[model samples]
Target: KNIECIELGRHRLKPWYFSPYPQELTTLPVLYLCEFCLKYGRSLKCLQRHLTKCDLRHPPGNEIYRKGTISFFEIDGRKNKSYSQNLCLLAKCFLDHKTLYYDTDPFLFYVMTEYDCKGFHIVGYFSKEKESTEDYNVACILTLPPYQRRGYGKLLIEFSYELSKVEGKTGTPEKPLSDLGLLSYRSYWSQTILEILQITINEISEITSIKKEDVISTLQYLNLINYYKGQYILLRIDSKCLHFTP
Candidate 1:
């Protein structure tokens, strides 16, 4: 599914793997600067302010190295120069693993990696298991060169999805729908993630005349979110989306 130089609305450049960016389909990032500050005891105001400027700022090691590809998108991104490293850190909350899950979990643990051996790139990754309702998988990080225009972080998401489907908590050949048996998904529309399905749908639909059904279908296919018991759930850890109505 991931290929080089894919087209995005007429733009053509090396394609990065697809990771959900603005899609409101699969999961939601549970951690935020506030969450971080609370846990790490950092100043909320400082973290919030940092969130706004962190991605574009240069780090300290640039004086030593002029070029290096880094992305919080993958574990290796942690090693890049300021430009790439900061982008990875600023984007850390949006990364897959650091995301923490809580009560009523659906996945066990998942991880993925990226590399810039030649040009910053997502090498490959995998998820381990979804042991029980207390289980939840982590999202993988991705990386790509700074020069490329066309890109994708979502393509690597399938690795986790496929892993979950295989070691699923519910809905298997014999068991079929574990009590925790609900598909885990995510939808990332904002880096800060301050919106919901109702609000996002309205905003996207206002620009086009497409029906709600069509809008939702596209979202679901992108692994953003899915309809279960009527409410729109976020794809954070401990979140579950399927059930047997018996």
Candidate 2:
């Protein structure tokens, strides 16, 4: 009942959940993916040929940020239709929660990549609504299973906030988040709040680009702060305990 597994780059990955891959896919076997362009095919030969000549040497988005070996590409889902659609298909295989598939027009996707001798390799990505009424900066995000827990998750979280800062707004993630988003956010929030305390900014929302409600709720989530009638209490934690490049 199970296809062998999708092959990307040098990894053979089992599908962790169902995705709306084309009904015709897997008529052959494992799906093959182009690490740069994110297109997939049912046959390796077609995939390889496409990989060599794929119009995009990287994500089909503009380079918004680049430092060291990492880059962030901001792709308008409406503009780069097929790449975002194909990405949703690939990311869906590993995500347990509801992931957007066809209706990508209202979103902007930020893709993260790591560079090496070969080229830029897709590492992970997060999507944000173009004009979200609920003030959500993240709809869905994922890191390839082959490249998890290496601080990229935190980096991804930071990039979302980084964008929020540039866009001149504050935001929270989407509602009904799955375990993956929850854990990653919790880990990230811990460090971010610690950094916040260090700056001791008089106006946190302005500096952090995190909503006041979101910040307080995150503090509550971590049990690091308590609010009584008049004043707030901050629990003690070591700044040294929080270490992250993000």
Candidate 3:
């Protein structure tokens, strides 16, 4: 019944919500929200007005990677309790209730940001378990609704795999993906695998005969495809490959 009690049901690219990086936003009539408390209003002006008095805002921690205008930060859950909690609270606005948070000691949160003359602005983030036998590097990921369809989600997924590549291991996202999450990961995998396979086939064909077996072997050799349970599954490979089948 309270007009001020705004519930952020889901992120939408509209003039009524707060975007982390307003400079990239072309639509000014969109609304805004506090990253910590999720307090939102009808327009960006009101969100900016409320930020001056918002108490829950906290700084994201230590920069780990920087390239062009984009930077990535790693937040230790135990050391940055307030920031991590605030992040979780904000994420919950979009995530379902089945998501659970365990001890902060066993997790590391990686946040992606974009920079400008003002400072760093949050784009999206992913959390990973510190030690896992399942080789799950990303526990959860979220790209604000406004930022969706902008390739930021794929960047987050790519960053997760980059970490795994560094560790000399293959990694996957933890189970039970929301519909959007599944779509993002699937697209990332499919597109990447297809690109690699196409290049590999072209290179091999220039020197030797190109065969379906050779294509599959090249993918398997690169650790780009795998066998799980009973079937051969292409890890991160596009399903549209005319020469390959799962």
What is candidate 1's lDDT per residue for 194-219, written digit by digit as tens? 33324455444343222344346456
The digit string of per-residue lDDT tens for model 2 on 1-246 reads 233488888788788887777667755468888877677778888987887677666787787777777877888999899888888888778776555588779888888888888778898999988888998988888888888978887788777877777677787889887887778887777777777662322256677677776666677887766665554445122223322221
lDDT of 2: 0.76
Q: How much lDDT does each candidate structure score?
A: 0.29, 0.76, 0.60
Off by over 4 Å in 1: 1-151, 168-246
Error of 3 at 157 (Å): 0.1
What is the RMSD, in Å, between candidate 3 and the native fold over all Cα?
11.3
Per-residue lDDT of 26-102 in model 3, one digit per residue for the tens?
Answer: 23444355654445456666677877786643345666677777777778888887567656655654566424453
Q: Which ten residues in a row have the lowest lDDT in candidate 1?
A: 237-246
Superposed model 3: Cα runs more than 4 Å off: 1-59, 198-246
Candidate 3, position 36, lDDT: 42
Clashes of each: 37, 0, 13
- Residue 24, candidate 3: Cα error in Å is 33
The collision pairs in model 2 are none
